[PDB]
C-alpha positions as a printed Julia matrix, in Angstrom:
442×3 Matrix{Float64}:
 -65.59  -68.71  -49.35
 -63.71  -67.43  -52.3
 -61.26  -63.74  -52.98
 -62.19  -61.75  -55.0
 -60.19  -59.79  -58.1
 -61.75  -56.41  -57.8
 -59.94  -54.13  -54.62
 -57.18  -55.24  -52.7
 -57.95  -55.88  -48.71
 -56.12  -53.0   -47.25
 -57.08  -53.19  -42.56
 -56.47  -50.41  -40.95
 -53.78  -49.71  -38.95
 -54.48  -49.86  -35.58
 -51.16  -49.96  -32.92
 -51.08  -51.54  -29.46
 -49.56  -52.18  -26.11
 -47.74  -54.43  -24.89
 -46.17  -54.1   -21.63
 -44.35  -55.83  -18.74
 -44.55  -53.07  -15.99
 -46.8   -49.93  -15.17
 -45.92  -46.93  -17.69
 -43.04  -49.73  -19.94
 -45.18  -50.86  -22.8
 -43.62  -51.68  -26.33
 -45.22  -50.95  -29.69
 -46.93  -53.95  -31.39
 -48.21  -53.05  -34.92
 -51.22  -54.49  -35.06
 -54.46  -54.72  -37.85
 -58.49  -54.32  -37.86
 -60.22  -56.51  -40.39
 -63.14  -54.91  -41.51
 -65.98  -59.36  -41.59
 -66.72  -61.22  -44.09
 -70.93  -60.68  -43.4
 -69.9   -56.95  -44.47
 -68.0   -57.83  -47.25
 -69.12  -57.62  -51.2
 -70.4   -60.7   -52.36
 -69.87  -62.25  -56.84
 -68.82  -64.32  -59.08
 -65.03  -65.29  -59.2
 -64.45  -64.23  -62.7
 -67.35  -61.1   -63.05
 -68.66  -58.35  -60.28
 -72.41  -60.08  -60.81
 -74.01  -60.6   -57.2
 -74.67  -63.26  -55.43
 -75.95  -62.14  -52.54
 -77.55  -58.47  -52.74
 -80.19  -56.7   -49.7
 -81.22  -59.79  -47.44
 -81.17  -62.17  -50.56
 -78.61  -64.39  -52.51
 -78.51  -65.95  -56.1
 -80.94  -68.74  -56.74
 -79.03  -69.75  -59.99
 -75.56  -68.39  -58.75
 -76.54  -69.91  -54.53
 -78.85  -73.19  -55.57
 -77.28  -75.15  -53.46
 -73.89  -73.71  -50.85
 -71.4   -76.84  -52.55
 -72.62  -75.09  -56.18
 -72.61  -71.24  -54.52
 -69.04  -71.2   -52.9
 -67.72  -72.31  -56.54
 -69.35  -68.94  -58.33
 -69.3   -66.64  -55.77
 -65.71  -64.78  -53.67
 -66.11  -62.08  -51.28
 -63.44  -58.8   -52.44
 -61.99  -56.59  -49.91
 -61.5   -53.16  -48.74
 -59.8   -50.24  -49.77
 -57.97  -47.63  -46.95
 -60.74  -45.34  -48.52
 -64.05  -47.68  -48.5
 -63.18  -47.89  -44.91
 -64.44  -44.35  -43.94
 -66.98  -43.45  -46.95
 -68.61  -47.38  -46.02
 -67.75  -48.39  -43.22
 -67.53  -46.24  -40.74
 -64.06  -46.85  -39.4
 -61.31  -45.37  -39.09
 -57.73  -45.67  -37.05
 -56.31  -41.65  -35.3
 -53.12  -42.91  -33.65
 -53.9   -45.47  -31.11
 -58.62  -45.24  -31.54
 -59.77  -46.83  -33.24
 -63.75  -44.95  -34.16
 -66.4   -47.88  -35.68
 -69.39  -45.52  -36.65
 -72.68  -47.16  -36.58
 -74.5   -45.86  -39.91
 -72.6   -45.6   -42.86
 -74.86  -43.77  -45.81
 -74.44  -47.74  -50.31
 -76.14  -47.89  -46.57
 -74.05  -49.57  -43.42
 -75.26  -50.67  -40.86
 -73.3   -51.7   -37.89
 -69.75  -53.24  -37.89
 -68.32  -55.8   -36.54
 -64.67  -55.34  -36.49
 -61.02  -58.13  -35.44
 -57.3   -57.09  -34.82
 -54.99  -58.5   -36.76
 -51.33  -59.49  -35.72
 -47.96  -57.42  -37.2
 -48.09  -60.15  -40.61
 -51.76  -58.63  -41.56
 -51.89  -62.37  -42.47
 -53.66  -63.2   -38.33
 -55.92  -62.45  -36.05
 -53.87  -61.75  -32.3
 -54.77  -64.29  -30.41
 -54.77  -63.02  -26.53
 -53.49  -65.25  -24.37
 -55.18  -64.03  -21.1
 -55.24  -67.24  -18.65
 -53.21  -64.21  -15.44
 -53.08  -60.92  -17.63
 -55.17  -57.61  -17.42
 -55.98  -56.34  -20.29
 -57.04  -52.35  -21.26
 -58.15  -49.48  -23.13
 -60.36  -46.67  -23.62
 -63.13  -45.98  -24.59
 -66.07  -43.49  -25.07
 -69.95  -44.8   -25.5
 -71.38  -40.94  -25.34
 -73.08  -41.45  -28.2
 -74.21  -44.17  -28.36
 -77.9   -44.09  -25.86
 -80.49  -47.23  -25.61
 -80.97  -49.07  -27.95
 -77.06  -49.46  -29.01
 -74.39  -51.07  -27.99
 -70.34  -50.27  -29.14
 -69.25  -54.31  -28.04
 -65.73  -55.44  -27.11
 -64.78  -58.98  -27.07
 -63.31  -61.41  -27.36
 -64.16  -65.14  -29.56
 -62.27  -69.15  -29.69
 -62.02  -68.34  -33.42
 -58.78  -70.39  -34.93
 -56.29  -67.32  -35.44
 -56.58  -68.14  -39.69
 -60.57  -67.81  -39.82
 -60.67  -71.44  -40.61
 -58.35  -71.89  -43.64
 -56.34  -74.34  -42.61
 -58.96  -76.6   -40.96
 -61.97  -74.94  -44.67
 -59.52  -75.36  -47.85
 -62.66  -73.64  -49.64
 -61.94  -69.9   -47.24
 -59.14  -68.65  -49.39
 -59.84  -65.03  -47.54
 -58.83  -66.69  -43.96
 -58.15  -63.95  -41.31
 -56.64  -61.27  -44.23
 -60.83  -61.62  -44.81
 -62.21  -61.11  -42.03
 -63.94  -64.93  -41.74
 -64.56  -67.66  -39.06
 -67.33  -65.91  -37.38
 -68.17  -67.99  -33.97
 -69.03  -66.73  -30.93
 -71.23  -68.07  -27.73
 -75.18  -67.07  -29.35
 -74.93  -70.09  -32.3
 -75.17  -67.39  -34.69
 -77.3   -67.88  -38.07
 -76.69  -64.79  -39.58
 -73.11  -65.23  -39.8
 -73.36  -65.67  -44.28
 -69.41  -68.82  -44.11
 -69.6   -70.54  -42.2
 -66.55  -73.87  -42.62
 -65.5   -72.5   -45.7
 -68.89  -72.65  -46.76
 -71.49  -70.02  -47.7
 -74.36  -70.75  -45.63
 -77.16  -70.18  -48.43
 -79.79  -73.63  -47.76
 -83.3   -72.53  -46.41
 -82.04  -68.52  -46.09
 -84.3   -67.02  -44.62
 -84.47  -63.0   -44.86
 -84.64  -61.03  -40.73
 -88.07  -59.45  -41.41
 -86.89  -55.5   -40.29
 -83.93  -56.14  -41.49
 -83.05  -55.45  -45.0
 -79.38  -56.07  -44.7
 -79.71  -59.97  -42.86
 -80.52  -62.95  -43.07
 -81.05  -66.7   -40.75
 -78.61  -69.76  -43.25
 -79.37  -72.63  -42.32
 -76.22  -73.06  -40.21
 -74.78  -71.87  -36.76
 -71.3   -71.31  -35.42
 -71.02  -71.47  -31.98
 -67.38  -71.05  -30.34
 -66.65  -69.39  -26.13
 -66.9   -65.87  -25.7
 -65.8   -63.42  -23.79
 -67.47  -60.71  -23.14
 -64.94  -57.46  -21.86
 -68.45  -54.66  -22.82
 -71.29  -54.67  -23.76
 -72.23  -51.11  -23.09
 -74.37  -48.31  -24.5
 -73.9   -44.43  -21.7
 -77.08  -45.93  -19.87
 -75.63  -49.63  -18.9
 -72.98  -52.02  -19.02
 -71.69  -55.76  -18.64
 -68.31  -57.8   -18.83
 -70.33  -61.87  -19.8
 -68.38  -65.06  -19.28
 -69.33  -67.82  -21.79
 -68.41  -71.24  -21.78
 -69.33  -73.95  -24.97
 -68.83  -77.91  -24.89
 -66.79  -77.61  -26.56
 -64.76  -73.74  -26.95
 -63.82  -74.0   -30.15
 -65.52  -72.97  -33.16
 -68.18  -75.7   -33.8
 -70.63  -75.46  -37.36
 -73.77  -76.09  -35.77
 -77.63  -77.65  -36.67
 -80.81  -78.2   -34.72
 -80.58  -78.24  -31.47
 -76.55  -77.85  -30.33
 -77.31  -74.46  -32.0
 -79.67  -73.92  -28.72
 -82.18  -71.16  -31.22
 -84.95  -69.43  -29.06
 -86.92  -69.58  -31.7
 -87.66  -73.33  -30.95
 -87.48  -73.43  -27.1
 -83.91  -74.82  -27.59
 -81.91  -71.71  -25.62
 -80.77  -73.71  -22.54
 -79.92  -77.15  -25.13
 -77.36  -76.03  -26.78
 -73.82  -76.63  -26.79
 -72.89  -72.66  -25.07
 -74.28  -70.83  -22.63
 -75.98  -68.56  -24.09
 -76.95  -66.02  -21.3
 -73.9   -65.8   -20.12
 -72.69  -64.76  -15.91
 -73.05  -61.44  -16.67
 -71.84  -58.74  -13.85
 -73.38  -55.22  -14.75
 -73.19  -53.23  -12.46
 -76.77  -51.82  -12.75
 -78.97  -55.68  -12.69
 -76.89  -56.68  -10.25
 -78.29  -53.41   -8.56
 -75.64  -50.05   -7.99
 -77.75  -47.51  -10.26
 -75.7   -44.66   -9.7
 -72.28  -46.23   -9.84
 -72.38  -45.96  -14.34
 -74.16  -43.1   -16.38
 -74.26  -39.95  -18.47
 -73.67  -37.06  -16.05
 -70.12  -36.46  -13.71
 -72.47  -37.28  -10.53
 -72.16  -41.04  -11.59
 -69.38  -42.54  -10.21
 -68.34  -43.86  -13.84
 -69.57  -40.7   -16.08
 -71.01  -41.5   -19.02
 -70.15  -38.42  -21.27
 -66.8   -38.7   -20.99
 -63.69  -40.9   -21.97
 -62.75  -43.77  -19.63
 -59.96  -47.19  -19.55
 -61.9   -50.13  -18.65
 -58.83  -53.13  -17.31
 -59.9   -56.21  -16.59
 -57.71  -58.68  -14.76
 -58.11  -62.48  -15.26
 -56.96  -64.64  -12.22
 -56.5   -68.09  -11.92
 -56.02  -70.66   -8.97
 -52.69  -71.2    -8.79
 -51.41  -67.27   -9.48
 -49.23  -68.17  -12.68
 -50.48  -69.0   -16.7
 -51.52  -72.41  -15.48
 -54.16  -72.5   -12.51
 -57.55  -72.73  -13.35
 -59.41  -68.95  -13.85
 -61.37  -68.81  -11.43
 -62.46  -64.49  -11.45
 -62.83  -62.08  -13.83
 -62.0   -58.81  -12.05
 -63.09  -55.53  -12.67
 -61.53  -51.93  -12.64
 -62.45  -48.12  -14.51
 -59.69  -45.18  -14.64
 -61.62  -41.77  -15.6
 -59.14  -38.36  -15.59
 -57.2   -40.21  -13.55
 -59.44  -41.55  -10.72
 -58.91  -44.76   -9.97
 -62.69  -46.43   -9.46
 -63.02  -49.89   -8.23
 -66.29  -52.41   -9.36
 -69.02  -51.59   -8.53
 -70.84  -54.45   -6.17
 -73.99  -57.21   -6.06
 -76.71  -54.93   -3.55
 -79.44  -57.11   -2.82
 -80.36  -59.13    0.48
 -78.53  -61.54    2.28
 -76.27  -62.27   -0.83
 -72.41  -61.92   -0.38
 -71.63  -57.47   -2.17
 -69.54  -59.71   -5.4
 -67.5   -57.53   -7.16
 -66.41  -59.85   -9.98
 -66.8   -62.92  -11.53
 -65.94  -65.86   -9.4
 -68.39  -69.26   -9.74
 -70.03  -68.82   -6.27
 -71.66  -65.31   -7.66
 -72.83  -67.02  -10.72
 -74.72  -69.34   -9.09
 -75.56  -66.97   -6.23
 -76.56  -64.47   -8.69
 -78.46  -66.56  -11.39
 -80.37  -68.3    -8.49
 -81.66  -64.44   -6.92
 -82.49  -63.57   -9.92
 -84.2   -67.53  -11.05
 -81.19  -67.88  -14.64
 -80.85  -70.85  -15.18
 -76.93  -71.77  -14.44
 -76.33  -72.75  -18.16
 -72.8   -71.31  -16.72
 -72.46  -74.15  -14.58
 -73.56  -76.83  -17.21
 -71.14  -76.1   -19.58
 -68.01  -76.34  -16.87
 -68.52  -72.86  -15.96
 -64.8   -70.7   -14.94
 -62.73  -73.88  -15.26
 -64.51  -74.36  -18.96
 -63.89  -70.29  -19.95
 -60.74  -70.31  -18.72
 -59.68  -72.98  -20.7
 -60.75  -71.04  -24.23
 -58.35  -68.48  -22.97
 -55.91  -70.55  -22.27
 -55.92  -71.8   -26.27
 -56.61  -68.34  -27.13
 -58.75  -66.07  -28.76
 -59.79  -63.24  -31.17
 -59.98  -59.81  -29.96
 -64.08  -58.0   -31.69
 -64.65  -54.53  -32.26
 -68.05  -53.95  -32.7
 -71.18  -51.77  -33.64
 -74.48  -52.6   -32.85
 -78.62  -53.19  -33.13
 -80.83  -55.49  -32.12
 -83.82  -56.65  -33.87
 -83.89  -59.73  -32.0
 -85.16  -57.5   -29.03
 -84.17  -54.62  -29.75
 -80.92  -54.38  -26.84
 -83.21  -54.91  -23.79
 -81.26  -57.13  -22.11
 -78.65  -54.48  -21.2
 -80.13  -51.98  -20.67
 -84.1   -52.09  -19.92
 -86.52  -54.39  -17.99
 -86.49  -57.99  -19.3
 -89.17  -59.62  -20.01
 -90.46  -56.69  -21.06
 -93.87  -57.1   -18.5
 -91.54  -58.09  -15.45
 -91.94  -56.35  -12.29
 -88.23  -53.81  -12.23
 -88.44  -54.74   -8.18
 -87.8   -58.85   -9.3
 -83.68  -59.24   -8.98
 -82.69  -59.38  -12.44
 -85.54  -58.09  -14.47
 -83.96  -54.31  -14.27
 -80.53  -53.98  -16.41
 -81.02  -49.85  -17.81
 -83.18  -47.24  -17.58
 -84.16  -47.24  -20.89
 -87.85  -47.88  -21.85
 -89.15  -51.04  -23.3
 -90.06  -49.29  -26.31
 -86.62  -48.36  -26.61
 -84.56  -50.09  -28.83
 -86.29  -50.15  -32.42
 -83.64  -50.79  -35.48
 -86.02  -48.48  -37.27
 -86.18  -46.24  -34.92
 -82.65  -45.89  -33.4
 -81.17  -46.08  -37.03
 -83.02  -43.04  -37.53
 -82.35  -41.52  -34.4
 -78.98  -42.62  -33.58
 -77.38  -42.61  -36.45
 -74.42  -40.56  -36.31
 -73.01  -42.98  -33.04
 -70.02  -43.56  -33.29
 -68.32  -46.03  -30.33
 -63.92  -45.34  -30.22
 -62.02  -48.03  -29.01
 -58.51  -46.59  -27.8
 -55.35  -47.15  -26.27
 -55.28  -50.9   -26.14
 -53.07  -52.35  -24.11
 -52.0   -55.98  -22.96
 -49.62  -57.69  -20.03
 -48.82  -59.71  -16.01
 -51.71  -58.16  -13.83
 -50.67  -54.4   -12.92
 -49.18  -54.03  -15.6
 -51.25  -51.65  -17.63
 -52.16  -48.26  -15.78
């Protein structure tokens, strides 16, 4: 995309901590940038929309190349962050409102480095990543997500010279779902064969998808939470078409370059329904804030080893809370993501181990070694109504069959039109982000 001249781009300042030992950290003066999908797209030498509602203008965008020549994405000024997009920062806390009323629904954002010209790339192997979260106002059907993806640090600017904005304009998004709803891919409008998504007034799908590796630290609302590894072959940003995208709609979910299911550790799905929930007698009380700690263990305990284990623990009101465990007869009580856990649990659930097909923890680790961009988002799910996260999936499945039940939400929950009314004022908060060696962040 070209860059427009109507509004300066002003990312929100967000300090994080880089740590060397427990309680010995230094501030890193980073910032938050809005994903290019949420930006106004208009004519390069005017005010005329190139995209309105869920459609590209066919006169301006008869082809992707013409669209890209004629159109530009514009900046987010400071005033518009809260007023238009529902984003705000107080000290080291970042807040994202779900619906902001001209009416904005959801948000996806990235962490910029201290220069505000590149994404802050995290080399996560043999490191610990930690943050405080509040998901108390997110119920069934919503997801306040924090995760990493194998985006380029410059959003693709060096690879795709028609991308003028780079990381500064939140470009280059890709993930392990190979999404077609990304409006700008490889420096070009994804306007070919663009199709609105029914019941989604703001979104559509273009000819291409954009694939890359994804490490989900946090997919969650107050009812259920998960962390998940998604390797791809290769891991780096890859525009896809046809079978390579692994499109759900053509029966290709397991035929593409990315592991779409991922290998998940989701406490409720692993059959501990009392670990996490909205109340003081759950082990971890989702009505109150808490700290989420993630440790990325290698084979030799060094930065050069292969990724072998994703460990997790929590801190809430000064109380250390170890992760829940897998709880099925004849299955080891795993409390972390490893290749063995993935094989054993997917075996039990009858899920295809595409994680293993894509190179497993080792391949996931190669993405983490090269460095990944931090994503913070809030969203509802127009495909599957978040049932995969917090309900029975498939909805018609027996909840006593291992793998089906992922949370207590009813299978009628999560319809975007309903959650966008009922949960309009939901806000996820991510704060006090800390990064360092294992054992350094609490």
